[PDB]
Amino acid sequence: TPQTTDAPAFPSNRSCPYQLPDGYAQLRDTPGPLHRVTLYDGRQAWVVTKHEAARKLLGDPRLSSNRTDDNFPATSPAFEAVRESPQAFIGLDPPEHGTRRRMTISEFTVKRIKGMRPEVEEVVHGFLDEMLAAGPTADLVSQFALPVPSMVICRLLGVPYADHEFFQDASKRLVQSTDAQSALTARNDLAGYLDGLITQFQTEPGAGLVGALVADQLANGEIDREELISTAMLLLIAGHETTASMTSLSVITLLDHPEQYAALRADRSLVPGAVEELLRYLAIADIAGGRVATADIEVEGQLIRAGEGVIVVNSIANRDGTVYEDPDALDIHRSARHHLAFGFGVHQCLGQNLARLELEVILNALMDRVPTLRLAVPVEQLVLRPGTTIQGVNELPVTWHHHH
Numbered sequence: 001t002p003q004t005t006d007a008p009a010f011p012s013n014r015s016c017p018y019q020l021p022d023g024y025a026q027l028r029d030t031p032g033p034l035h036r037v038t039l040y041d042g043r044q045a046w047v048v049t050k051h052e053a054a055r056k057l058l059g060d061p062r063l064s065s066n067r068t069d070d071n072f073p074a075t076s077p078a079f080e081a082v083r084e085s086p087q088a089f090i091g092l093d094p095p096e097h098g099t100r101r102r103m104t105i106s107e108f109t110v111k112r113i114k115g116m117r118p119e120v121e122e123v124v125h126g127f128l129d130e131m132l133a134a135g136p137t138a139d140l141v142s143q144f145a146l147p148v149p150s151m152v153i154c155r156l157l158g159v160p161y162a163d164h165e166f167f168q169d170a171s172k173r174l175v176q177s178t179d180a181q182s183a184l185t186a187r188n189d190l191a192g193y194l195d196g197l198i199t200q201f202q203t204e205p206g207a208g209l210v211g212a213l214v215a216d217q218l219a220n221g222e223i224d225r226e227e228l229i230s231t232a233m234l235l236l237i238a239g240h241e242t243t244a245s246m247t248s249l250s251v252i253t254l255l256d257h258p259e260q261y262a263a264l265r266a267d268r269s270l271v272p273g274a275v276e277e278l279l280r281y282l283a284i285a286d287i288a289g290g291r292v293a294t295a296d297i298e299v300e301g302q303l304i305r306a307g308e309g310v311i312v313v314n315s316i317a318n319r320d321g322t323v324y325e326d327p328d329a330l331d332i333h334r335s336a337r338h339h340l341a342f343g344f345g346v347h348q349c350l351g352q353n354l355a356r357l358e359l360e361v362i363l364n365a366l367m368d369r370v371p372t373l374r375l376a377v378p379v380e381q382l383v384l385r386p387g388t389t390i391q392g393v394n395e396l397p398v399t400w401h402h403h404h
């Protein structure tokens with residue numbers, strides 16, 4: 001009795017940091033914008049696997065972002081720690097979505113991100129100062145890739161970096177837990193921490209976005225205290241984990257494509273385009289593609305019924321050869337325009353240009369200060385995170401030429 005199914009298990013795990021899982025390549029190749037999958041609990045759901053259809057469905061308000069809905073597509077038991085939890089605007093639909101998102105946009109404008117560049121460069125070179133002073137070997141994740149965005153997002157939020165070991169540990173536990181209880185505990189750890197910060201700011205107004213939300217919107221009853229906690233937690237976790245993963249995966253990927261890494265070093269005007277290509281190619285945030293239909297939607301002859309879960313798999317859409325010629329070739333010179341690594345539409349990543357700024361500063365700094373950087377272990381020996389979380393590696397051993 002054959003085991004072939006027409007609803008393969010989803011998600012799949014990467015076997016190479018920068019390649020689609022074998023099962024995803026299969027979905028990429030199968031014609032049609034949609035494909036059935038089976039989630040961890042046996043429920044069937046749709047995945048979107050082509051680029052233009054992914055944009056269209058991300059733009060369709062009939063695909064709700066409401067994670068509290070019973071039919072929202074959960075890809076791991078740990079999701080249940082989010083289904084029964086208060087809801088940042090990543091999980092809201094218009095019109096509620098806009099009222100909450102606009103409370104935070106002032107910290108992520110182009111003018112603010114520009115103003116942050118000297119501060120980001122200082123943080124980047126500070127952690128490189130310390131890592132290089134100590135000499136190889138080092139774990140790039142714990143010594144550089146994680147602390148840099150953590151320090152940056154703490155200052156943006158007004159979260160004291162002195163507490164970094166606490167919330168770095170909680171952030172990891174929340175995002176990578178494979179059971180609801182572990183994720184729920186980390187959620188509650190972070191919430192209790194953030195609730196105390198709020199009360200402190202009500203005594204002594206503080207800097208940063210959390211300080212501003214306490215002094216203004218909270219004081220005016222325009223955001224619930226618990227929504228403020230959920231909102232700060234979203235930005236804190238998003239600010240830590242995603243950028244850190246782009247750094248480690250970009251280093252791995254660039255060292256596996258030395259001709260392009262050399263071309264990048266030789267002409268730094270290529271770095272912004274290289275960042276876009278790396279974002280398209282590494283597409284680390286499929287876990288951010290879940291949707292639930294609130295009405296029937298006809299998609300190129302296929303029918304999404306009201307109440308069905310839909311996952312917009314931007315990593316697969318980003319390998320659509322009708323948009324990106326030879327889509328599985330890394331090409332830092334190609335047009336990676338219109339990639340979906342940050343989503344599309346009303347929920348397109350609030351932090352996208354901070355992430356672009358941090359990756360540019362980081363790649364230039366590594367090429368400037370550590371041109372002899374190389375992995376200290378074979379790529380095959382790295383441990384990749386599973387497809388139920390943000391893609392990446394939890395450790396990245398590196399070495400380099402030690403200058404005394």
Ligand code: HEM
Pocket residue numbers: 065089090091101234235236238239240242243246283284285288289290314340341342343344346347348349350351352354355
């Ligand atoms: C390379 C790094 C990053 C990637 C690949 C990424 C990816 C994404 C994606 C795909 C979405 C859309 C989710 C959806 O449609 O439901 C999203 C939304 C979001 N991201 Fe990021 N992100 C990154 C970095 C950041 C950073 C540094 C922040 C800083 C706070 C951040 C904050 C957010 C927020 C707040 C949202 C929700 C926006 C909304 O619902 O209106 N992200 N991100």
Ligand SMILES: N#C/C(=C1/SC[C@@H](c2ccccc2Cl)S1)n1ccnc1
Pocket residue numbers: 081082090174175233234237238242285287288289349
């Ligand atoms: N989607 C998404 C996304 C997230 S980071 C915070 C994640 C989270 C997971 C489980 C429980 C609570 C929370 Cl708050 S969900 N992200 C990543 C980059 N930009 C946005």
